[PDB]
Amino acid sequence: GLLEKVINERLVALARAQVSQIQRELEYPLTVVHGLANSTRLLGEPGADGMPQLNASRDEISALLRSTVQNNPKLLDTFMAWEPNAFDTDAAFAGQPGKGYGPDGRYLPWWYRGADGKPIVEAMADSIDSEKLLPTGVRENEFYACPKENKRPCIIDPAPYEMGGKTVMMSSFNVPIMVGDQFRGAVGADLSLAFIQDLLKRADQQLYDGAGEMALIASNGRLVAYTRDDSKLGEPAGSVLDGNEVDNLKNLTVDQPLYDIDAEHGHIELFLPFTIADSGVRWTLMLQIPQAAVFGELQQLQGE
Amino acid sequence: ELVQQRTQGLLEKVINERLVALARAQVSQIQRELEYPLTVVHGLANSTRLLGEPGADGMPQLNASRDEISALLRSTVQNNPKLLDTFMAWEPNAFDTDAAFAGQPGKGYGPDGRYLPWWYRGADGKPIVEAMADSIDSEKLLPTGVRENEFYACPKENKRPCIIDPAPYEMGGKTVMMSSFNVPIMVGDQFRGAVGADLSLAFIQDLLKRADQQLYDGAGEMALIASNGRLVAYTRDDSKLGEPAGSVLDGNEVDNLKNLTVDQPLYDIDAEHGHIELFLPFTIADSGVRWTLMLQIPQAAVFGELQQLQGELSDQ
Numbered sequence: 228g229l230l231e232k233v234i235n236e237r238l239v240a241l242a243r244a245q246v247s248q249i250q251r252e253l254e255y256p257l258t259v260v261h262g263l264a265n266s267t268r269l270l271g272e273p274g275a276d277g278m279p280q281l282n283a284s285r286d287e288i289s290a291l292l293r294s295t296v297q298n299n300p301k302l303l304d305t306f307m308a309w310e311p312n313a314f315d316t317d318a319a320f321a322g323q324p325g326k327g328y329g330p331d332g333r334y335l336p337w338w339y340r341g342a343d344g345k346p347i348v349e350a351m352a353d354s355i356d357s358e359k360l361l362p363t364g365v366r367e368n369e370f371y372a373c374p375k376e377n378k379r380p381c382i383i384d385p386a387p388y389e390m391g392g393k394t395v396m397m398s399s400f401n402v403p404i405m406v407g408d409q410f411r412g413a414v415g416a417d418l419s420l421a422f423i424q425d426l427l428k429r430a431d432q433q434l435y436d437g438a439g440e441m442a443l444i445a446s447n448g449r450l451v452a453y454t455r456d457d458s459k460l461g462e463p464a465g466s467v468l469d470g471n472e473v474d475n476l477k478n479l480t481v482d483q484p485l486y487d488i489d490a491e492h493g494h495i496e497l498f499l500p501f502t503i504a505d506s507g508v509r510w511t512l513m514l515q516i517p518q519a520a521v522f523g524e525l526q527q528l529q530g531e
Numbered sequence: 532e533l534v535q536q537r538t539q540g541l542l543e544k545v546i547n548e549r550l551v552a553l554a555r556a557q558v559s560q561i562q563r564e565l566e567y568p569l570t571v572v573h574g575l576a577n578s579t580r581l582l583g584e585p586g587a588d589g590m591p592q593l594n595a596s597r598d599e600i601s602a603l604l605r606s607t608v609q610n611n612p613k614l615l616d617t618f619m620a621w622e623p624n625a626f627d628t629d630a631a632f633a634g635q636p637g638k639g640y641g642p643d644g645r646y647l648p649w650w651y652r653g654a655d656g657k658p659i660v661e662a663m664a665d666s667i668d669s670e671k672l673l674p675t676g677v678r679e680n681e682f683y684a685c686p687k688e689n690k691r692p693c694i695i696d697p698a699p700y701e702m703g704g705k706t707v708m709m710s711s712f713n714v715p716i717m718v719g720d721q722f723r724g725a726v727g728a729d730l731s732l733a734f735i736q737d738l739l740k741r742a743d744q745q746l747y748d749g750a751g752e753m754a755l756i757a758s759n760g761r762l763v764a765y766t767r768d769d770s771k772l773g774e775p776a777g778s779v780l781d782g783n784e785v786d787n788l789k790n791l792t793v794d795q796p797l798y799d800i801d802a803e804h805g806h807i808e809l810f811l812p813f814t815i816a817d818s819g820v821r822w823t824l825m826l827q828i829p830q831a832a833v834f835g836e837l838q839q840l841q842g843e844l845s846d847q
């Protein structure tokens with residue numbers, strides 16, 4: 228039908244705007260940490276006098292990280308890990324705690340905000356080499372192993388980490404520190420799922436007057452956000468969504484919308500896969516809207 | 532017969548709502564792409580300000596030389612192919628004594644030592660630097676209605692990010708629209724300088740041309756109008772980019788743009804000229820930009836569609 232087509236084109240356009248709004252949120256941390264990687268690699272790149280182009284101390288690099296946290300309130304944190312002896316001699320820094328160094332001197336700072344909002348630092352010695360499987364299906368060290376192994380940017384699916392006495396679910400945005408063809412380390416920043424969820428909830432309230440719900444699904448099919456119920460974050464979409472929805476989640480092409488009508492529940496399903504910057508990472512936005520909210524004007528024309 | 536009017540009004544609403552949603556989608560896509568240069572230059576500003584912000588020891592948090600700051604700018608160009616350039620300018624004696632660096636323009640300094648590097652790519656793609664001494668203090672008006680130094684004066688005056696209305700630029704034997712994206716280097720409450728990068732806006736022309744094909748077999752036009760009234764994009768004709776929008780649109784409509792409200796759509800049915808227009812003002816981040824997307828549809832296309840929709844209702 229021609230009228231159905233005009234209504235459905237409105238729906239797709241509204242969904243596409245929700246995707247580009249989410250991309251703005253998710254591409255931002257990647258560009259932040261690209262900036263830090265593009266600066267830090269100058270520690271290892273000679274200049275016209277044969278000395279490093281950046282001769283910054285560890286205290287100065289940490290200042291850059293802390294300034295990132297300070298002036299990027301949307302980011303949960305900023306962190307960086309060097310390979311053993313990547314840019315200096317770790318042994319000179321061994322036995323110095325509370326600076327983000329491992330016990331052997333390896334540079335591993337994780338900067339985030341304490342209770343008063345002031346930045347504090349934790350060394351990632353415990354997680355950087357950990358093969359522990361977290362309950363969301365993510366290994367504890369994947370924020371570093373993935374950029375080390377693939378030598379390109381990595382976005383990690385939702386995972387819980389302990390932060391100042393509480394468990395925080397988060398996704399990390401990671402870039403390798405490359406000098407030539409050599410992996411020297413990686414730098415990253417997290418977004419909390421609570422942050423992404425709050426934004427998706429607010430965005431949903433402006434979509435068809437809030438009649439429906441949205442789900443953001445990571446590369447492993449687990450929920451980054453789910454406007455109906457915060458308790459489902461991190462959980463598999465296959466343990467929260469419909470048989471029909473879970474099937475449609477398998478029916479998707481690489482980057483192309485899937486439209487479906489769940490008559491059993493009287494709502495429209497729209498799945499839009501999308502990629503995050505040039506990282507090649509593909510997540511999915513799901514819109515679930517009551518049929519009456521989308522087709523109310525048709526209902527009104529036919530009703531009279 | 533009032534049933535006919537109520538029915539026609541509801542069909543027109545469905546049509547108008549589709550066009551509004553299409554407009555909002557172009558705005559959202561434009562905002563996604565144009566955050567990128569702001570994030571890059573925010574990173575450079577947030578590093579450079581540490582030259583003047585003390586630590587607990589009372590001493591600055593970053594003890595970097597001018598050469599090291601320039602290396603950060605050079606690395607930005609090298610590692611962001613989409614950016615045309617990256618440039619930074621300090622206030623006189625902002626972080627050191629300019630006079631100690633006088634007489635060395637080959638490093639991006641002014642003649643009396645002011646730090647003014649502009650880094651771009653030479654013919655072989657390797658970055659090279661030039662001093663901005665000839666532009667940094669110039670309030671000469673460009674055709675676009677901005678000062679030659681707007682990229683610096685606007686962040687100095689407003690102490691927040693500034694996106695300068697685009698200027699034409701030759702790229703690959705074609706003229707494209709180019710804007711700079713600028714942020715202040717703030718130490719406490721003090722403006723110390725600014726850092727920016729230029730980005731081509733050709734992707735907007737391409738975006739809007741593709742979107743304009745979705746509706747009415749491409750019979751409409753889409754435009755993006757800057758605050759100076761000039762065309763950032765115009766799907767009908769690449770040759771019009773950078774021209775006053777009043778050359779393709781009723782002049783008083785263009786004069787009216789300053790009165791519109793951000794994110795509020797506005798329809799104008801110009802029955803005299805047989806076109807309907809939808810305007811959608813928008814901004815970018817905290818830059819305070821005032822840009823307007825415009826969708827123009829011929830009345831004959833809409834009328835024909837309404838007849839088809841009524842025909843489908845009749846046949847029900």
Ligand SMILES: CC(=O)OCC[N+](C)(C)C
Binds near residue numbers: 306350388417
């Ligand atoms: C416990 C720990 O060190 O976590 C580090 C990983 N990160 C920054 C992604 C949370």
Ligand SMILES: CC(=O)OCC[N+](C)(C)C
Binds near residue numbers: 682709711
């Ligand atoms: C080439 C070009 O875009 O001119 C503007 C350069 N700027 C803004 C650094 C002075």
Ligand SMILES: [Ca+2]
Binds near residue numbers: 472
């Ligand atoms: Ca369903």
